[PDB]
């Protein structure tokens, strides 16, 4: 694993000392080399999981996130290469360093076994994000947004830690697969119930429900492309991975400790998908769509069925990539205009003839057009939920419909009307942003082709 | 669709518009042009009957009864004119009706060909900046402090010089 | 009716447009610029047919239940290209 980390810990001094004319290219290409080397984990010949020490490990549920992160790093770099163009070399170097620290932390956590290490990394993820969001935004409320982000996250963090302590004491160790081979069952009293809470509350507060979805839009809006990318892609996924790895112990509590959370997740999926219709701000629309899909993820995580877990992982990866892509497109249309509003720029596709086909290929992946990992996940999760009850296809379908609606609303208020006549600032497409779109897409094709990699624990 | 209307209207134009609308809906009801001519002549007689009258009372009464009769005996699916709203060509070509300023961002390897036309753009824009500032004073001098204006636009009271605000009208692409 | 200033503005813009279009014209020499049946039959039926026959007959019929030839529709009397001794007809066909 050091083979993945150490070079990512060398990109930093590399950035510091390299000359301005060359740091961008050098660090970018070498981060791509890191992404490449990050595939050794896929030599999972047999079912014996990979273990490198008492301090690291890998797994089928973690490897995807690792590669996706090591591959979203350079895309953040590139998408962060036209703005802050008049900001000093030292400042842009700081930005690069923060991105790289995010990468390294995310890798170490998605790999680590001991949930306490996982937790310290899960909470160290903040500093770079808070910074990136406050020191490089474009509005004023970014401050309140960062505050909300930080404090939601830490409120979650605390009882999680307290329960990790209670465990480490009652049980002997915290190492995973030992928690498995020596788990037990609980008398199911108010004590163990509040323990279940203090263990899942943080992961949920992070992966937003209806009740606490508030810090997502502010972040994705006030913050720049890279922060938006990384939020929509991974910093949510951390909660899901933690919940998956930890729920192994709390059996059986999660049968009746789920109804409220499943209910909230579904209702929130619906209401947020509806708001996605009448939400002006494009990035806010995208954020609420992300909420709508992560609600499915959660409803599939709780009930603990194998189909459900595989669908969760599929939809997870798919949404990560697709949201990064949509945010790239938004930023693109913003740098030329400097207004997030959806109804200002209209009737494109007459001057950006190609870009549309990078807009289209995203929506179709949002509304679950097959053959896509998106629909595979949505469908397996709907199957699990139908088994768990026959009266949830209702909500699945309402969500599918409202999505099929607002995805096209977005396509049609930006690439289907008639062109304005005062947007003389429409610098044509840059090879760079076209490349970012292509790189976010192509992997969707290859994974639609061969998804056995992207299944999960149960496959 | 170039000139703009006044705020208020007059009995004259109201009656004219009612007439044209009713005649179109009649062309739609009664297909054959012979029947259309017949009933159009009948409507013309109906109008010429009360034409010479001038009492605002009878005017308003007849107009507001005429509009009700019209709305109650109109054609559900009328005859829309393709090139106008409601039709099957309205905006059909707006997807191709690009403006000019897309030109500037061409690449020189492309405007290499089509050289002549780009030899004349400059002397056109040159025909704009050289006579822009003047087009402002013509209004800022005649921006009557009375402050009660319409949307009309005065011409170049001088000779040789060009009018004001010709860019957003000239260069408007074709209809095709 | 039209006001005279309006008529004059119209004349100006009309004589401007009727020159802008004369301009948007383009002279010549711009745009500047620096058996087949059998060949198509070949390149669009044959080659793919070869590749696909390879695929089928050496990767698909070489696997347990890739292709499923529904059982043929035998009749009475119909003999068999295998051993398949003769088969019997039915009984009386009155009327």
């Amino acid at each position: 694993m050091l083979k993945i980390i150490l070079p990512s810990l060398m990109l930093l001094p590399l950035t510091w000392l390299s000359s301005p004319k060359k740091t961008w290219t050098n660090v970018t290409s070498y981060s791509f080399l890191i992404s490449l080397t990050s595939l050794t984990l896929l030599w999972q010949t047999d079912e014996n999981y990979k273990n490198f020490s008492n301090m690291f490990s890998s797994d089928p549920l973690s490897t995807p996130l690792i590669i996706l992160t090591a591959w979203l790093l350079p895309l953040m770099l590139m998408a962060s290469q036209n703005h802050l163009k008049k900001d000093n070399n030292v400042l842009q170097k700081l930005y690069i360093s923060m991105l790289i620290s995010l990468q390294i932390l995310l890798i170490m956590t998605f790999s680590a076994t001991e949930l306490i290490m996982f937790y310290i990394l899960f909470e160290a993820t903040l500093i770079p994000t808070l910074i990136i969001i406050t020191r490089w935004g474009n509005q004023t409320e970014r401050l309140n947004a960062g505050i909300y982000f930080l404090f939601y996250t830490l409120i979650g963090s605390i009882p999680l830690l307290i329960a990790l302590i209670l465990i480490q004491n009652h049980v002997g160790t915290l190492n995973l697969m030992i928690l498995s081979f020596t788990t037990h069952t609980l008398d199911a009293s108010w004590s163990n119930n509040l323990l279940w809470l203090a263990c899942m509350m943080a992961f949920l507060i992070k992966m937003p429900l209806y009740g606490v979805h508030l810090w997502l839009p502010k972040a994705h809006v006030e913050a720049p492309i890279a922060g938006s990318m990384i939020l929509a892609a991974i910093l949510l996924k951390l909660g899901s991975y933690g919940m998956i790895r930890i729920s192994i112990i709390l059996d059986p509590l999660t049968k009746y400790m789920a109804y409220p959370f499943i209910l909230l997740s579904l209702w929130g999926m619906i209401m947020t998908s509806s708001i996605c219709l009448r939400q002006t701000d494009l990035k806010s629309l995208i954020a609420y769509s992300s909420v709508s899909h992560m609600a499915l993820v959660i409803a599939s995580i709780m009930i603990q069925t194998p189909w459900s877990f595989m669908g969760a992982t599929m939809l997870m990866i798919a949404h990560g990539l697709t949201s990064s892509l949509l945010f790239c497109l938004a930023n693109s249309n913003y740098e030329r205009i400097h207004s997030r509003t959806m109804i200002m720029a209209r009737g494109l596709q007459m001057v950006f003839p190609l870009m549309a086909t990078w807009w289209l290929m995203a929506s179709l992946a949002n509304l679950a057009l097959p053959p896509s990992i998106n629909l595979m996940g949505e469908l397996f999760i709907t199957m699990s939920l139908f088994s768990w009850s026959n009266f949830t296809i209702i909500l699945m379908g309402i969500n599918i419909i409202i999505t099929g609606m607002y995805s096209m609303y977005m396509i049609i208020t930006t690439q289907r009307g008639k062109l304005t006549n005062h947007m003389i600032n429409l610098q044509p497409s840059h090879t760079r942003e076209l490349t970012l779109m292509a790189l976010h897409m192509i992997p969707l094709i290859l994974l639609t082709t061969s998804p056995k990699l992207i299944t999960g624990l149960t496959m | 669709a170039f000139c703009a209307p006044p705020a208020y209207l007059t009995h004259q134009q109201k009656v004219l518009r009612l007439y044209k609308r009713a005649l179109r809906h009649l062309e739609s009801w009664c297909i054959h042009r012979d029947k259309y001519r017949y009933f159009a002549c009948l409507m013309r007689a109906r109008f010429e009957e009360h034409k010479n009258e001038k009492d605002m009372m009878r005017a308003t009464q007849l107009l507001r009864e005429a509009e009700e009769e019209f709305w109650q005996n109109q054609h559900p699916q009328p005859y829309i004119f393709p090139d106008s709203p409601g039709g099957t060509s309205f905006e059909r070509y707006e997807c191709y009706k690009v403006p000019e300023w897309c030109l500037d961002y061409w690449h020189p390897s492309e405007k290499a060909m089509y050289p002549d036309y780009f030899s004349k753009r400059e002397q056109w824009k040159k025909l704009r900046m050289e006579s822009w500032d003047r087009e402002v004073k013509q209004l800022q001098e005649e921006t009557s402090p009375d402050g009660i204006m319409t949307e009309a636009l005065p011409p170049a009271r001088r000779e040789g010089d060009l009018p004001p605000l010709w860019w957003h009208i000239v260069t408007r692409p074709r209809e095709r | 009716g039209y006001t005279p200033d309006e008529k004059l503005r119209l004349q100006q813009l009309r004589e401007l447009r009727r020159r802008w279009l004369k301009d948007q014209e383009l002279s010549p020499r711009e745009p500047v610029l620096p058996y087949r049946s059998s060949l198509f039959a070949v390149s669009h039926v044959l080659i793919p047919m070869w590749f696909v026959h390879y695929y089928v007959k050496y990767h698909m019929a070489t696997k347990p239940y890739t292709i499923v030839s529904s059982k043929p529709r035998i009749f009475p009397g119909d003999t068999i290209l295998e051993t398949g001794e003769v088969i019997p007809p039915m009984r009386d066909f009155p009327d």
Binding site: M350, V351, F352, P353, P428, S429, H430, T431 | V98, P99, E100, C102, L103, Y105, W106, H107, S109, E110, Y114, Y117, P173 | Q24, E25, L26
Partner: peptide, 11 residues
């Protein structure tokens, strides 16, 4: 034989 306005397309 007339012109046809269009965007860049080279990029």
């Amino acid at each position: 034989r007339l012109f046809v306005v269009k965007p860049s397309l080279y990029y």
